[PDB]
Design a protein around this ligand. Structure first.
Ligand code: W50
Lengths: 300, 237
């Protein structure tokens, strides 16, 4: 169990921690979140009571430092910060637990939701996508764009997801134009998995972070990445049987966790009706197909 | 973007463009088998690639051997069309390569785009037009050549014969499409129209008769009346 204390809550804000969230009222006595499970990455995020525009948040791992939140009134936002003095830190936390000004990470013991959503997500990879290497944590918000999106304007504040493009020379070998494009096994297996990702787990982590960034901040380029990385697999006739089985679980929990009312912006009709009903892997997503059809039949 | 009735004069500017129609690439007769089932037998086809400005038409004859042992042939045709168009482009010198290629059927966008990735500065466009280039096999000498072909083969010529010597490309293209559109609606009649007078001959290297300006007007009018006619006979109007 670890802790993210807050200096204070000067402004009314909705606070997000992983899939949970609670309302904090302006200058209520609040001083942060305790009992945060060690062992997974996490994301604390924020939506100010005034400007529902811009959700923003920080990914982090209590293994990699003592981190706290402090509202900054020049810049207008709750800022994450690392405390180098470990003794100073335990002291403050203990002070706040004794006075009981911390809410508790409220995990049910039967619940593997967060783990399932972050199974392959690792801080080091996130920090290669959100380059800000003076911080051990990584900032993200609604309006950030992707490298691929800046090619179709500030490069330091971008999401450097892996560029996937089905109509590219990377995707498409000379003389196998129709073969490579209609069956993306090459692209998937050799170019991306063997070439760029190394293993299936790194691929899946990027895919899980893309999705969470889309769902927690409605980051639009993240969503496109997510659907892109799904689509490549579904459009490849040759996939390791183990990767297919893990994808099906991965997508199941995503679809399970999605707000019913946010579904219409975050689910791409074409990709899913293609993956589930047209692509090579139409038969291979039993759990994903069952929950999609019982929850969002309108999309299909 | 898409090519339609508005941005129509862009065909006649000085930007090198080609049109690609694939409708006659993959052609079959349907027949009964001895056991009472149905089967397809395939016949020669042809990729119709047309510079609407200069009148240049490079026909790419598609020999039935290209299909042998292949599955999903209607799909492969589109890939083969784009393979052949790309190969054409690649053979032309740089200054002759087209800046746009407009396909008559949206199915050819992806095959082509994929095949052209090496040519990022060539725009692949669809069109909203109902263009009648599929009737190109109703032009007699073209029907005999594609049919008589025994191997893959490419014909280089001009599809407006010598018209540009006396008319502009806009008018030349409009005459082309009128005759084509008439050949499509009622080939027998349209052809009867074009050949009634036995003294107006077709040259060795020409598809259309050697009409005079005066004569072209009679003809164009008659093909008008025909296309208007053949519409009535259909919709009973
Ligand atoms: O082969 C050519 C005639 O054919 C064409 C003429 C001009 C453009 C295209 C074609 Br194909 C010579 N011969 C005269 C009549 C028989 C063939």
């Amino acid at each position: 169990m670890n802790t993210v204390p807050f200096t204070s809550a000067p402004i009314e804000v909705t606070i997000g921690i992983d899939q949970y969230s609670f309302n904090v009222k302006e200058n209520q006595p609040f001083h942060g979140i305790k009992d945060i499970p060690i062992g997974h990455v996490h994301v604390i995020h924020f939506q100010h009571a005034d400007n529902s525009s811009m959700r923003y948040g920080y990914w982090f791992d209590c293994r990699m430092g003592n981190f706290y939140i402090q509202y900054d009134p020049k810049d207008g936002l709750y800022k994450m910060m690392e405390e180098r003095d470990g003794a100073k830190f335990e002291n403050i936390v203990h002070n706040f637990k004794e006075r009981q000004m911390m809410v508790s990470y409220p995990k049910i013991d039967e619940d593997d939701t967060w783990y399932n959503l972050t199974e392959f997500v690792q801080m080091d990879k996130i920090r290669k996508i959100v380059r800000k290497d003076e911080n051990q944590f990584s900032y993200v918000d609604s309006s950030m764009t992707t490298v691929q999106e800046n090619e179709l304007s500030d490069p330091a504040h971008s999401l450097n997801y892996t560029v996937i493009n089905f109509k590219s020379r990377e995707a498409i070998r000379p003389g196998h134009e129709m073969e490579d494009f209609l069956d993306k096994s090459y692209y998937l297996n050799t170019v991306m998995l063997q070439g760029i990702f190394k293993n299936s787990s790194n691929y899946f982590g990027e895919l899980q972070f893309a999705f969470l960034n889309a769902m927690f901040f409605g980051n639009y380029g993240s969503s496109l990445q997510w659907h892109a990385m799904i689509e490549l697999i579904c459009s490849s006739a040759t996939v390791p049987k183990h990767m297919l089985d893990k994808l099906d679980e991965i997508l199941y929990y995503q679809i399970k966790t999605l707000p019913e009312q946010y579904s219409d912006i975050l689910l791409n009709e074409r990709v899913w009706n293609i993956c589930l009903y047209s692509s090579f892997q139409k038969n291979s997503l039993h759990n994903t197909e069952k929950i999609m059809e019982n929850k969002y039949p309108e999309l299909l | 973007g898409a090519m339609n009735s508005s941005n129509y004069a862009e065909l006649f500017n000085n930007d090198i463009k080609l049109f690609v129609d694939d409708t006659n690439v993959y052609r079959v007769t349907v027949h009964k088998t001895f056991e009472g089932n149905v089967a397809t037998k395939a016949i020669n086809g042809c990729i119709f690639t047309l510079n609407p400005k200069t009148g240049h038409l490079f026909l790419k004859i598609i020999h039935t051997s290209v299909w042998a042992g292949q599955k999903r042939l209607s799909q492969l045709a589109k890939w083969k069309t784009a393979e052949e168009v790309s190969a054409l482009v690649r053979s032309l010198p740089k200054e002759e390569q087209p800046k746009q290629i407009i396909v008559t059927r949206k199915a050819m966008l992806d095959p082509l785009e994929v095949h052209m990735l090496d040519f990022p500065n060539i725009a692949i466009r669809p069109t909203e037009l109902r263009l009648p280039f599929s009737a190109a096999m109703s032009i007699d000498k073209l029907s005999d050549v594609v049919m008589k072909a025994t191997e893959p083969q490419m014909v280089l010529f001009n599809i407006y014969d010598d018209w540009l010597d006396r008319i502009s490309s806009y008018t030349a293209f409009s005459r082309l499409t009128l005759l084509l559109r008439a050949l499509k609606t009622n080939e027998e009649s349209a052809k009867m129209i074009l050949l009634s007078d036995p003294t107006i001959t077709i040259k060795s290297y020409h598809l259309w008769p050697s009409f005079t300006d005066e004569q072209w007007i009679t003809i164009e009018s008659q093909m008008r009346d025909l296309i208007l006619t053949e519409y009535g006979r259909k919709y009973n109007v």
